What does this fold into?
Amino acid sequence: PTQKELRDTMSKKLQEAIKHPDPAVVAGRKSAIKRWVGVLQDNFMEHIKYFKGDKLKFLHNVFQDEGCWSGVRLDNAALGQRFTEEKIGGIDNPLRKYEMACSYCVVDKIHPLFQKRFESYRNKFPGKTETEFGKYVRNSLLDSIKRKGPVFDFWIDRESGELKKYDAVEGFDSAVKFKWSEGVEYFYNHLKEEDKEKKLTEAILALSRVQSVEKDAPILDFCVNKIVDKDTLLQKLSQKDKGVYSLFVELIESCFFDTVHDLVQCWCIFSQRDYELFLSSLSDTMLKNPELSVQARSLIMEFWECGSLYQYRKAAVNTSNYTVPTSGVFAELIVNWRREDIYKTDEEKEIEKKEILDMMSFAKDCFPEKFELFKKLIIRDLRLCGREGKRVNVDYGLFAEELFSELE
Amino acid sequence: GDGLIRSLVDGDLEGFRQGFESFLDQCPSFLYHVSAGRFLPVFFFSMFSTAHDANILNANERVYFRFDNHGVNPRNGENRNTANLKVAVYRDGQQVVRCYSISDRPNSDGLRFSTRERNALVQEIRRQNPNLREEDLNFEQYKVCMHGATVFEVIREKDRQGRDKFAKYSASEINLIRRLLGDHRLTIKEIEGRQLNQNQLRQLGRLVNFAQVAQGQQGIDNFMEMLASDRRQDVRDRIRREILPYITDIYNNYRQVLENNIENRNQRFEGHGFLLGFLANFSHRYTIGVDLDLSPRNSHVAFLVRHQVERENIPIVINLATRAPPYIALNRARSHAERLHVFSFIPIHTESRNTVCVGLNFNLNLDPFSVDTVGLQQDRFPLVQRLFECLENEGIRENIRDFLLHHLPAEIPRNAENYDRIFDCITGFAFGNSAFDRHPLELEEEDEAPITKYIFRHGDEGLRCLTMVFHAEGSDIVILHIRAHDAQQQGAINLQTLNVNGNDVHVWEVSCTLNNQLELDIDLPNDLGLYHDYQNNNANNFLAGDLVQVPNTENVHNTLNQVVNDGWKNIAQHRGLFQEISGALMPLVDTINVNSEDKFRSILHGTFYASDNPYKVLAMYKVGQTYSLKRGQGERVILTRITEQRLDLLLLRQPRENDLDTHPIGYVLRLANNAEEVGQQQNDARQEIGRLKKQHRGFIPITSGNEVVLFPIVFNRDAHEAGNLILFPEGIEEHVHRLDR
It folds into this structure.
């Protein structure tokens, strides 16, 4: 299949291990599994692509452990020790331990694990000094493993073979440049207490770009949630072009919803297009992760019902040039409402209804002379575009017409 | 620019010629399909039917059209999906009616406007101007045609006498007369000469009818501004909420006119022509680039909209499916996008890490399109590693096959007439990738093993089979066979030369066969057993031939680091690069059999791919086109001949924040079969470089610098030593080509 499809088959299989009483935790931890495996690009899928049977049972035992979790995020320290054990639960470790010690900054085990790999690779060889040959074998081995990422070339000196030591400032700047989520956390703890706030700000600005990748968002969540004065950070971000917007959409698509709630409540600016895109992004994410429906919906209603954003919500429902800026948002909300692939309480469906209806009432009151077209446009977005979780060969436009009837 | 429809409506033919010339540079694969069904006619129809909505034309400038379908062939009496497009423009208060005929064929029967078409036209003109005087109307008939692909002409027919200014019959009329009579092989003189019955004339009058296009409820003036952005979420919303709903509406609005008087219309090519036309209406205002892939089993189109030289704008990939579910069409669009760096030039004109994918089926009543976002990054496929991994893991064979097939040049058609070209490219690519791989094998059990490569020379000198052996020291051995459809020998390869401690060492075989349908089949890997049991059981089954060890090629990787970077304008660094490549291939010249320019190019292509540097290497890369004009004689004939310019190999770095100069390196490759053929091959290569130096706008979006390096390379098959295997210029300065911005 496609690489994306292989990622989800591994994501969905690793999601079976997640078991918790609260439905919100299970579903937030499922998003972390997709982040760990990779959604739009490969993350740890590179190492677990061929894992089958007992190899997958090892990862099943790791992610089902409460100690490897911290709320809905992965405990990197716990993972680092587990992924460097010889065997847990009687099951051998199928991962490459040196690569895991590098990725999770298990600095006590990096060098002894690399020497094991170096010795077994040297012994497979037949004019060059034995010292120079070892330097050659070390370079050939490190260059091979470096194909999977620059982290695997980070800790081992190529001239002496000794474990490299780094200043926290240098390792922090390198982990951001490497888009290395686990590395950003390790060096932050070793940073000076006065350098912490200044360093986090630099990282947020650098990765809050339009060219961002999903790997940037974990770093952004960690850095934002540890910034003390989010106010002063929001001022510097606004000076950067689309810095606020880029930080927002990155955490939304990666399901860092608690990080955005705290961000939107502080300074209860961004452009009108930014406003409309936040809603479009959330609504899409809602469909890509339907078990997080409530959380995403709640974030939409905060962007919508923010009194300071009154000028933005009115233009959002302003019908102009045979389109309304939020036709998709409405359409995607309706699709969620009619979701029969996942069990939902009838109460949930109902709150989901009055959720939409209150938004349509705002559009009816704001522009009543354009409200007739608004209706045609909404059903247009529901019959012309196919979305995830939307069933085939059923008219979702009839459902919108049902809501319009109740509205009047 | 000034606008294609604008220059056409105003009668500015030279302004239309220069404008259409710029669109042909934007869509380098447009001409390959102008003779495929109604691709070209629907293209121009789209441009006209959407011009009012784009504010290109005013409501005063009325546009009337008609699809003049060809019908049955006079030679074999079979249905044709081709047609001509008759379009006329009338502005109220003006006496000029500009009439246009668009067709693939330069002088197709019925291409001229007919008398009945003139009556059907003036009928539509008066639906708004009832008492209009037709005698005061002056008709200006024009022709626009392109065929082959190599020629594009715009003609203003001379003024003609009354009743001679219009032809007797259009293409559709000629088809109806033949159907009304019995013979389908009636010539024009026959048809024109026969007197027609009054009932037959009524059917002719009911057949010819014109329709009018007008502005819609949705203006599309700024539709390309919405796509010239770097925000994937914005571009996604604009396509899903405004752009595609409009295209779906307009195509479905004129849906009945498309299917009328036509049988077995090519929906793939007509749907793609409609999309290209929509884009062509903005060609004069924006730097658009369209990469069309309409080869058999391909229905993709990828484009990128920019104002000037933005490097982070979001590409869009659309897959058109005539009879497929919308999700299926999106899957195909996502699959194209993941491999967009191999296939397309779009990842060269933008450095965006994401692409907006769109799957479109115009025929569906519900869910005609679906849009999603896919990551865009260049992948490094480890051929030798995946070969070892595919022995215990299923599905890697698909990726291995896709790796070899997708890197085939799109110029070479995958038919029976180019079987040897396809086989030469696949084997040469596979050789360069595997022979020039410096990395060891990453074993499954937390270990690494160095790989010594071998290549086998079959006893039959003229056998189309590439056989290589990869020995992972301390681990298993993999024998790779890439055989032609008839090279199915199953004799065992002697591995006695391989120094193998017995261990748990197994010998594996992976056999690949290119069939007559041009599909590469990779059989299930077979364990041939332990090394010692393999040698004893095949004691009298060893294939006649020699197993030649591949030399170490690690210095080529280090040399390419200097050549691709600081030494890209250094002729001596390039000279040393090919001297080392020559030093590696010389012990293998007989076993490899570089018997064609395709094999030579693919060996180098696989060599530059496997090496970390260059970041990107492309084969048979189209840099652009050249347009030579001819003017003739009122009768105003403008003829444009198009000649393509391609680079055999283009080596590019990746744009980085500190250095945006991709250091483009281009190689013109030729093969000399004999030492006497050498001088002619070198001169031919030097002549092609001189023509490549006439191209500029093709090299400008590929780099931020202002120079390109071009070198002529000749493979000397009869070279005595390695110093003369690959012939490189000795320098007795013509490789650095400054770009005009």
Observations:
- Residues 554-630+643-738 of chain B form one domain.
- The longest helix of chain B spans residues 232-253.
